[PDB]
Amino acid sequence: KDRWGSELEISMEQVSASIGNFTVDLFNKLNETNRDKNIFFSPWSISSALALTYLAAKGSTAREMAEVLHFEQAENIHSGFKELLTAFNKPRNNYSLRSANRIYVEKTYALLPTYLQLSKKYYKAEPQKVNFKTAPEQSRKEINTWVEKQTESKIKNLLSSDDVKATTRLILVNAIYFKAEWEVKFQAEKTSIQPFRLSKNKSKPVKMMYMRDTFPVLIMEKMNFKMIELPYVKRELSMFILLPDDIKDGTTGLEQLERELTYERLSEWADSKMMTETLVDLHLPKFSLEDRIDLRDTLRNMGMTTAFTTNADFRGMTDKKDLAISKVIHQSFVAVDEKGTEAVAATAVIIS
Amino acid sequence: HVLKFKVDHPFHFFIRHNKSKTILFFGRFCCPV
DSSP states (O other): OOHHHHHHHHHHHHHHHHHHHHHHHHHHHHHHHOTTSOEEEOHHHHHHHHHHHHTTOOHHHHHHHHHHHTOTTOSOHHHHHHHHHHHHTOOOSSSEEEEEEEEEEETTOOOOHHHHHHHHHHHOOEEEEEOTTTOHHHHHHHHHHHHHHHTTTSSSOOSOTTTSOTTOOEEEEEEEEEEEEBSSOOOGGGOEEEEEESSSSOEEEEEEEEEEEEEEEEEEGGGTEEEEEEEBGGGSEEEEEEEESSOOSSSSSOHHHHHSOOHHHHHHHHTOTTOEEEEEEEEEEOEEEEEEEEOHHHHHHHTOOGGGSTTOOOTTTOSSSOOOEEEEEEEEEEEEOSSEEEEEEEEEEEEO | OOEEEEOOSOEEEEEEETTTTEEEEEEEEOSOO
16 A cells, blocks of 8 residues: 555655745746846745745744745645655765755744754754854854855855844755756767847857757647756756747747746646657757845745734744744856756745 | 757756656746856
């Protein structure tokens, strides 16, 4: 029967589905303002940090978070996060994948022992006492140093001076690091400078990688796009790319795609039975992106409001109703080249 | 004949853990550097 295995796979499916739904909702919200900019984030990192926060949440504070983060269909969302974390951190020798969580707490501020044992259980987050009251900069620096260590030195200064203050009582941090070679690597010899068209009337040079090989491709004629899967070693992870057939609008060529984007659509396309192995002439830019944002305003616009107010209820971790989220800092990095991809991010939920 | 897949204009991309189908990273690339 293996009802234990079946249950835990359902748990994991719940969190994966939540993260997918949250990814599209978050992108759609970020896109409303930033229609013409690069966007890059780790929804795993954001959701993990906010799930560790959700663990402490009660009442309408919790209910709002569950709705925005899509935790509604789960009796124990924290179990799914635990099992996914365990899967990602499973020891291996063929590529790098790891994620970690940590609780930074004001040394004077006592947290409920139930919260700490559940945080350790589900998120492997250990509490570290720090002096926020009379040493914010020393506390900020040690946090940034941990994040630096988890991100292979790619995120060296996650928190700024404006983020950590004397009023800060708790900082819940997630980090994720990924680096893997492609299953089939590009030959640098075949890389050449080519135009990347930002629009019908604008282009810039990029180093364009090239290979001819076989990849899963979905051709969606009636929606004028194609999608390709680019496996990393052993196909345990892949990069999916969704490309409109041309630039057929007045901006990026993504207007229609972004208007019609849903997780339901994204999900069924990615695993479509019509996505099949196809010999392709693949041209892919060598590119890198960095991003940093305080998601507070974004999350409030999505419906997570109470958590950022004086009425916030985090009595899952404390007996005092004196805590509220001040900031949700997220920083990300990715580098795509001929050998593979490096991707890394961190999220700090700052509570005062 | 070979299918042309030329990524020389804006696209969406994501990195997925395939067994669980979890999206670990998501982005849009529309603007070099």
